[PDB]
Hints:
This is Probable serine/threonine-protein kinase roco4. By secondary structure, the protein is of the alpha+beta class.
Amino acid sequence: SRLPTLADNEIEYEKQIGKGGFGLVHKGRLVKDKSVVAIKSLILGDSEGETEMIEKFQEFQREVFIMSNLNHPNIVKLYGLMHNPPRMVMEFVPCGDLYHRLLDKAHPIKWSVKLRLMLDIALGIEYMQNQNPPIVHRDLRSPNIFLQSLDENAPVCAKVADFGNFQWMAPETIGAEEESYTEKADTYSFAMILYTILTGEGPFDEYSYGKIKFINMIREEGLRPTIPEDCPPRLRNVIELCWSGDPKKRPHFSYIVKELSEL
């Protein structure tokens, strides 16, 4: 739908954040709104294969298409597009990502904030699955959860970002033709996000197997991370149901949100 265009006179540049899949990431600011932005550029890789340049362009376009229709506080917003070099202008999220925050073991996130993070992400995914047709992220993991604030009283704590690691992926998606990724695949990945918030640990990090065996254990033997004994029964049930081997047993997000709110 509606995606405004912005020129260089409308954008102020600052620093270079990093390298992405199709180009560069930059920290900036709108001169109109004075609000801070993250800018993702498209760069065509120098030879890199002929077919590599095509998929780079098509991934950039896919991200534009997906982000331009999503409008929710728990999902990173696309403000606009730029042309000189093609660019996406997205809101900047100031407190890093969930993956890196959880690595700080000396400073555990307190329980009330953990619940806010769980609910925030659930709300974002609920919105995605309520679209027509339902939006599927297809790369849900803790590095793609951006942290707005760790204040338990903030309007928004977490945002879903970087719309698309077998330990995050639903069993029916592993080594499968991509169009087997239903919305229920995101629901499985969400269970693993809930697990990582709860424990501060990487999902499946308690196990070590060769890749073929690992996948077989997940797919055929229902191997899942161990939920701690002190986990609240209602949270345990949500996690367990969300990572069901059978995708149709993974709950609708209205149920997930209700259950999490009662924690």
